C-alpha cells in the first residue's frame, strides 16, 4: 500500500525500495498465497511504468511462465490477470497478429466466463486492450462498439488521481 | 481452381486467417459437446486429403 502510494505520486524510485523489503517479509511468513499477491502487484506496477522492467529482480517473462502453470484450482482471477500481461507484452513485442489474437482470446474468454461486473477493474482493462488492439489494426468500427463500454474518470489504482483529467485533456 | 500467386503490388493482406477459427455447439444424448466449426457445404468443398 505504501508502495502504491509512492507510485501514486510518481515517486517511482522510492516505491521501488519500498517493494523489495516486501519480498523478504513474504519469505519469512513462509505462506504461499501472499506470493501470488506480491507477484501480481509487480507487473501492475510495471504496466504503468514499463521503463522500470530492468530494475526488478525478476523479469516480466518469468512471471508469465510461472503464473500460467501456477495451479488448476484456488486461482479464479490469477489466470485472468496472467494472460492480459502476456497480451500487453505480445503487442509491445510486435509479435505476429495470429499469436496476439490468440493471447487476447485466452484472456477474453477467462475474464467473461466468471462475473465481469464484480471484477470491474479487469473488465475495464479488457476494453482498453481490445480498443487499442483493434484500433492498431485500423478497424474503428469494431473499436467504436467497445469504446462505449470504456469507463471514463474511473482510471485505476496506483496511478495518480488526476490522470483521468489529463487523459481527457490530451484528446 | 484459383491461382493467387504472391505479388508485391498486392498489399491486400488477410486477417481472417490470423483470427482463430470459430467452433460449433452440438449436444448429444449424453452431454453438450464442442466441435470445430465446418461450413454446411464445406464437407464436399473442403481441401481434399487426396
CA distance B18 to chain A (A): 4
| CA nearest neighbour of A60 among A80, A96, A88, A23 | A88
With beta carbons under 8 A apart, name residues in chain A contacting B17: 98
- Whole-number Å distance between alpha carbons of A63 and A103: 16
Rounded distance between C-alpha atoms, residue A98 and residue A70, angstroms: 25
Spatial separation of the C-alpha atoms in residues A25 and A28, rounded to whole Å: 5
Q: Which three cell numbers stand for residue A123?
A: 473488465
Read off φ and ψ for residue B16, nearest 5 degrees: -60, -40
Q: Which three cell numbers stand for residue A160?
A: 495518480
Whether the Cβ atoms of residue A96 and residue A86 lie closer than 8 Å to each other: no
Contact A97, A88 (CB under 8 A): no
CB B17 to CB A98 under 8 A?
yes
CB of A103 within 8 A of CB of A87?
yes
Cα–Cα distance measured from residue A13 to residue A75, given in angstroms and rounded to the nearest whole number: 31
Placement of cell 519469505 in the chain: A27
Chain B contact set for A102 (CB, 8 A) = 20
Cα gap B42→B38, rounded to integer Å: 6
CB A106 within 8 A of CB A112: no
Alpha carbon distance A165, A162 (integer Å) = 5
Could you tell me the resolution of this structure in angstroms?
5.4
Q: Residue A114 and residue A91: Cα distance in Å, rounded?
A: 25
Q: Mark yes or no for CB contact B18/A98 under 8 Å.
A: yes
Determination technique for this PDB entry?
cryo-EM
Å between B12 CA and nearest CA of chain A: 13
Determine, for residues A97 and B18 on separate chains, whether the beta-carbon distance falls below 8 Å.
yes
Query: Which three cell numbers mark A122?
Result: 479487469
- Whether residue A101 and residue B17 make contact (CB cut-off 8 A), yes or no, is no
Task: With CB atoms and an 8 Å threshold, state whether A105 touches B15.
Answer: no
Q: Which residue has the cell 517493494?
A: A19
The answer to whether A164 and A156 have CB atoms below 8 angstroms apart is: no
SS3 A59: coil
Q: Which of B12, B17, B18 to substitute to test the interface with A, most A CBs within 10 Å?
A: B18
CB–CB contact B18 A101 (8 Å)? yes
Q: Which residue does chain B place closest to A97, by CA atoms? A: B18
Residue pointed to by grid coordinates 467497445? A146
- End-to-end Cα, chain B, rounded Å: 15
Q: Are A146 and A134 in contact (CB under 8 A)?
A: yes
* Cell, residue A68: 500460467
* Helix, coil or strand: residue B35: strand
Distances (CA, A) of A109 to A90, A126, A157, A158, B26: 17, 11, 24, 26, 19
Amino acid at each position: 500500500s505504501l508502495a502504491t502510494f509512492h507510485s501514486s505520486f510518481n515517486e517511482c524510485d522510492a516505491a521501488i525500495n519500498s517493494f523489495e523489503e516486501a519480498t523478504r517479509i513474504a519469505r519469512e511468513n513462509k505462506d504461499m498465497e501472499t506470493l501470488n499477491l506480491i507477484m501480481i502487484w509487480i507487473i501492475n506496477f510495471i504496466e504503468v511504468h514499463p521503463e522500470y522492467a530492468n530494475r526488478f529482480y525478476i523479469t516480466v517473462e518469468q512471471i508469465i511462465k510461472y503464473l500460467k502453470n501456477s495451479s488448476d484450482v484456488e486461482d479464479a482471477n490469477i489466470f485472468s490477470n496472467a494472460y492480459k500481461f502476456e497480451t500487453l507484452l505480445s503487442m509491445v513485442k510486435e509479435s505476429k497478429t495470429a499469436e496476439v489474437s490468440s493471447s487476447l482470446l485466452k484472456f477474453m474468454a477467462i475474464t467473461l466466463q466468471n462475473v465481469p461486473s464484480q471484477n470491474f477493474d479487469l473488465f475495464q482493462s479488457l476494453v482498453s486492450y481490445e480498443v487499442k488492439f483493434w484500433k492498431e489494426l485500423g478497424y474503428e468500427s469494431i473499436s467504436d462498439v467497445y469504446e462505449k463500454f470504456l469507463s471514463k474518470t474511473s482510471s485505476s489504482s496506483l496511478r495518480n488521481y488526476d490522470s483521468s483529467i489529463i487523459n481527457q485533456d490530451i484528446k | 481452381p484459383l491461382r493467387y500467386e504472391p505479388n508485391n503490388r498486392d498489399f491486400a493482406c488477410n486477417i481472417i486467417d490470423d483470427l482463430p477459427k470459430l467452433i460449433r455447439f452440438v449436444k448429444d444424448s449424453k452431454r453438450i459437446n464442442i466441435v470445430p466449426y465446418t461450413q454446411p457445404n464445406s464437407l464436399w468443398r473442403g481441401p481434399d486429403e487426396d
